[PDB]
């Protein structure tokens, strides 16, 4: 079966969030993690893997701590060359117990055996108040891609083109992204929980299942509702 669509009042209302939408915007803006063919260099917790990635900024490397929902996932990818992609956070990010040290969840896929000679296009149908007035595609060269990478790619587009997230707030009241693949479907709430503060780590933690979808069979739909 599939996951049931958002019940009424289930989705977070951006107007119920009184902090700065900026703290959410920063999760889907230009900044994020994208590393190709890297292998964990260290580990803090049993369920995380630490990587050293080349920084496009300047001749230098960054540190990214990747946390999974369990140790088995970490054990599976340690010692493996993987591609890492995801929304990272710095604020409460620790590597033991800095613009170059960040933390994230999941976003890991084995490199060898998962590459595609060419790029695949995944369509995104955006519904604003129930009407599909905008449709764009995202591309990937990974046979198995994490929902997180596709989620980021989609939201990043909506941020740069539809102002999904703005410094102060959002032009949309609620919003969720739904991934459809064969007999399964699931969605994430795109808006921050109610309150005056937004916990980026807690929010991004939803990606720690390292959930993946087949790039050739996945379909994406984003449902946004504007503010009256």
């Amino acid at each position: 079966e599939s996951q049931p669509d958002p019940k009424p009042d289930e989705l977070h209302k951006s107007s119920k969030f009184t902090g700065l939408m900026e703290n959410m915007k920063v999760l889907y803006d230009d900044n994020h993690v994208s590393a190709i063919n890297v292998k964990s260099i260290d580990q803090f917790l049993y369920f995380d893997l630490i990587y050293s990635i080349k920084d496009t900024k300047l001749g230098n490397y960054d540190n990214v701590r990747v946390e999974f929902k369990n140790k088995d996932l970490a054990d599976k990818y340690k010692d493996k060359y993987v591609d890492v992609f995801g929304a990272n956070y710095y604020y409460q990010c620790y590597f033991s117990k800095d613009k170059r040290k960040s933390c994230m969840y999941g976003g890991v896929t084995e490199h060898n055996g998962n590459q595609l000679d060419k790029y695949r296009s995944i369509t995104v149908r955006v519904f604003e108040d129930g009407k599909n007035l905008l449709s764009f595609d995202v591309q990937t060269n990974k046979k198995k891609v994490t929902a997180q990478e596709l989620d980021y790619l989609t939201r990043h587009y909506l941020v740069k083109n539809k102002k999904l997230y703005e410094f102060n707030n959002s032009p949309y009241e609620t919003g969720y992204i739904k991934f459809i693949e064969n007999e399964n479907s699931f969605w994430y709430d795109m808006m921050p929980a109610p309150g005056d503060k937004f916990d980026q780590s807690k929010y991004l933690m939803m990606y720690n299942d390292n959930k993946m979808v087949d790039s050739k069979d996945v379909k994406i739909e984003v449902y946004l509702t504007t503010k009256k």
Side-chain angles (χ1 to χ4, degrees), residues 2-227:
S2 309
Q3 191 195 322
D5 284 0
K7 311 160 102 302
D9 288 80
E10 192 181 335
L11 288 179
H12 295 158
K13 299 179 180 62
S14 71
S15 61
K16 281 303 177 188
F17 168 60
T18 56
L20 288 185
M21 190 59 73
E22 175 71 3
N23 304 319
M24 166 63 92
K25 180 173 187 296
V26 47
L27 298 184
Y28 301 89
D29 245 328
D30 295 356
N31 182 267
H32 67 295
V33 170
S34 181
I36 301 167
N37 200 52
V38 292
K39 176 154 73 65
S40 65
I41 61 171
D42 192 11
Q43 189 165 48
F44 168 34
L45 300 187
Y46 275 106
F47 51 104
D48 74 60
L49 290 174
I50 301 177
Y51 297 76
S52 187
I53 315 308
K54 45 183 170 58
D55 191 359
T56 179
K57 175 181 184 297
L58 266 62
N60 202 296
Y61 287 85
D62 289 321
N63 295 302
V64 181
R65 175 163 176 281
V66 182
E67 224 183 87
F68 301 93
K69 65 168 189 165
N70 56 65
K71 173 178 180 293
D72 294 330
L73 278 166
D75 289 347
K76 181 174 181 298
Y77 294 109
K78 183 202 277 285
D79 313 328
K80 255 184 166 55
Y81 278 89
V82 304
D83 295 331
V84 185
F85 193 106
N88 58 332
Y89 67 90
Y90 299 67
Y91 181 65
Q92 211 57 286
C93 156
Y94 297 73
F95 283 62
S96 66
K97 243 297 186 299
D98 201 305
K99 64 181 194 292
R100 276 179 152 48
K101 281 193 160 60
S102 75
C103 287
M104 66 175 274
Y105 300 85
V108 173
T109 53
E110 186 178 10
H111 187 88
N112 294 31
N114 192 229
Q115 304 307 116
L116 279 164
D117 294 328
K118 254 47 185 175
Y119 281 75
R120 279 177 177 157
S121 248
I122 299 170
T123 298
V124 184
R125 299 186 70 206
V126 182
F127 303 76
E128 301 169 73
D129 287 305
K131 187 74 281 297
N132 176 47
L133 281 177
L134 163 67
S135 289
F136 65 97
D137 310 304
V138 297
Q139 300 79 50
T140 182
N141 67 325
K142 296 172 184 179
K143 294 175 183 163
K144 309 241 65 176
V145 60
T146 64
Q148 177 182 187
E149 171 167 7
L150 295 179
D151 188 3
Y152 172 79
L153 289 183
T154 299
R155 305 206 199 173
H156 179 76
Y157 185 94
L158 290 181
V159 165
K160 306 298 179 174
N161 299 289
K162 300 298 299 176
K163 316 196 306 174
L164 172 54
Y165 300 127
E166 290 185 281
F167 191 87
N168 205 60
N169 44 68
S170 174
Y172 305 105
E173 189 58 278
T174 69
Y176 71 105
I177 173 173
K178 173 174 172 178
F179 301 88
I180 303 154
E181 174 176 49
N182 304 314
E183 307 321 308
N184 301 300
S185 82
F186 58 97
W187 54 270
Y188 299 146
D189 191 319
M190 303 189 272
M191 293 294 166
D196 69 5
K197 223 281 299 200
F198 174 61
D199 193 330
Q200 302 171 306
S201 173
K202 184 171 176 180
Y203 182 68
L204 293 176
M205 197 177 277
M206 68 166 160
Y207 297 137
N208 73 5
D209 57 354
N210 205 54
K211 192 171 195 318
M212 314 175 286
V213 300
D214 194 313
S215 54
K216 77 177 175 65
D217 311 309
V218 69
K219 305 179 299 181
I220 304 168
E221 296 184 323
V222 171
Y223 296 89
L224 305 179
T225 71
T226 60
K227 294 186 294 179

